[PDB]
């Protein structure tokens, strides 16, 4: 008897690969940038959960 996790209720968002925040380049650092409509957010690939972008959430290059 196998117990498994099944995602559901997909919703579409606008996404970008990188962000600047000040004339720079920042990458999600194991995440993805999503545009909700009010501002950009960082979230997991499963179970959408808005988080405000921050230096820790990203690595600069």
């Amino acid at each position: 008897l196998h117990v498994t996790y099944v995602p559901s209720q997909e919703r579409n968002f606008t996404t970008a690969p990188a962000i600047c925040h000040e004339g720079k380049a920042y990458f999600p650092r194991e995440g993805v940038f999503v545009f909700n409509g009010t501002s950009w957010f960082i979230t997991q690939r499963n179970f959408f959960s808005p988080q405000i972008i921050t230096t820790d959430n990203t690595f600069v290059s």
Binding site: E10, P17, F27, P28, E30, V32, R45, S61
Partner: protein, 42 residues
């Protein structure tokens, strides 16, 4: 033989466009690099 070719055509199409959860082929390859151990910016 045609039916088998239909199955393989759909498998490649699903790989190249993705429950579906569609995602661009670029952000997907960046995700793969994470599993390898390399950084996405590379």
């Amino acid at each position: 033989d045609d039916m088998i070719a239909a199955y393989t055509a759909a498998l490649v199409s699903g790989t190249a466009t993705a429950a579906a959860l569609q995602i661009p082929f670029a952000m997907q390859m960046a995700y793969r690099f994470n599993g390898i151990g390399v950084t996405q910016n590379v």
